[PDB]
Subunit: 151 residues, 4 copies
């Protein structure tokens, strides 16, 4: 059943499956990141960035990417980066997240870059920025992570 759906509801679902398809093709991937397709990558320099293409799926009634999704993008770049600095087997959880929505998210993609400010045995402070498919800063933020210790 797909009869009634318009253009926008067309790919807003097409991609939902390219992802549910991609999430199957490999574990360790989470749902929320699977659909939005927040692809994490590493350049030939060793750098790291979590950019993602903008689709009607991520916008709001103001037609700009959801601040909350931009939040999640930054949270990821920062989360995945933190985990890298941890011994094998360990994980971190976001303690505090502070975002500064500089400019509106629009265009092809958003790009997120993170950087460790200070790493402690328990708490890790990180800064990070989200740019546009061009270069303007969409958001800037920092946050704190804790080395998970499940009871």
């Amino acid at each position: 059943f797909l009869s009634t759906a318009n253009e926008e509801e067309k790919d807003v679902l097409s991609s939902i499956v390219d992802g549910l398809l991609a999430k199957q093709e490999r574990r360790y991937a989470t749902y929320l990141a699977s659909l939005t397709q927040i692809e994490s990558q590493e350049r030939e320099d060793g750098r790291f960035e979590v950019r993602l293409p903008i689709g009607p799926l991520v916008n709001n009634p103001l037609n700009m990417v959801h601040g909350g999704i931009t939040a999640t993008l930054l949270d990821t770049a920062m989360g995945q980066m933190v985990n890298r600095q941890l011994p094998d087997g360990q994980s971190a959880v976001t303690s505090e997240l502070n975002i500064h929505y500089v400019k509106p998210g629009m265009g092809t993609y958003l790009r997120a870059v993170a950087s460790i400010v200070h790493q402690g045995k328990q708490r890790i402070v990180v800064e990070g920025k989200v740019y546009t498919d061009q270069g303007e800063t969409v958001a800037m933020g920092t946050g704190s992570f804790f080395v998970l210790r499940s009871r």
Copy 2:
């Protein structure tokens, strides 16, 4: 639609995905997310499902923030004119306890209302009355 994609995890998920996408075309849900994630926007509730869980089997952070984000936004448009809307500017969020249980509840209340900027705070909770997240936000009018 070669959507012949599968296990049970995906079974349930995609069921909400579509139960939710076709709840938007029937225009009962504002956005795709307020529906895709059954946001009981009316206070804002969040049905805790594997669709909203990170790899560590708990409500995803970006989510708990979006939940708080939304609650806060509405809360600021209730005090705004028909031709003016509030856009998040800043979002401070403290994660206190994992997002776990049947659902998440986010209550937001304005701390200060100015001609250009409004300050708001609010929390998120689990069904058993536990406090999940807590943060502040600043919204500019447009």
Copy 3:
């Protein structure tokens, strides 16, 4: 030879003499162990039903616009939430400020500042606390949250 220097009076206008007077008051008090730091001395901070610090809005605390320096406002808030957390802790444990988030609402003015604080979460590793700063009118100067680390 400070006394030689304290001829700052030979020219001192009224507030010049009144600011100096209050400074020496606080110090004396600092000796009578009324405070822990000189910061508390000169500022004159005095501390639900019990936890709310108050700071007298004099010239020693204002900025080039005759309102309390947001710096000091934040320092006051940090004090309210700071000693508020110390109370909720065993003799063997203490806490240092980890994260401080503040939203400035109205210019700090009047005869004093009053900040009330409350624990938003008491966990093994950190204690999150929210709090607000008020005028002698009840008007909100600033609202902010804070995270405290246990040591």
Copy 4:
């Protein structure tokens, strides 16, 4: 009667007597108007723009700025970052414009210690509405005492 109240220097240890000495200098440099405010005057901050765009504010560390454990008061740290971020914002603004600290966020990392603190701020965004800036505080070793962001409202 500030004089008859100098029974403070007759039960005052080196530190206490050392403090007031600075304080008097402060207040003294205050009336000569070498400083607009008492806070800046009593803390002796030195501010300046760097070759790059960033802004710098250093603050001498003395007993006057420490907390019960001879560590720079978290408040003076915040107030410093704020000061740096402010002067930064204001230097990038027209003569007929000004800015006021709207939001402030800080993450404490290492105990402020040594002989002086060095806060460094840089603009992250420059709207005509609000100005988002960012900064860091360093010890005299280069160790990061604290990191934080601040949004400023334009007037």
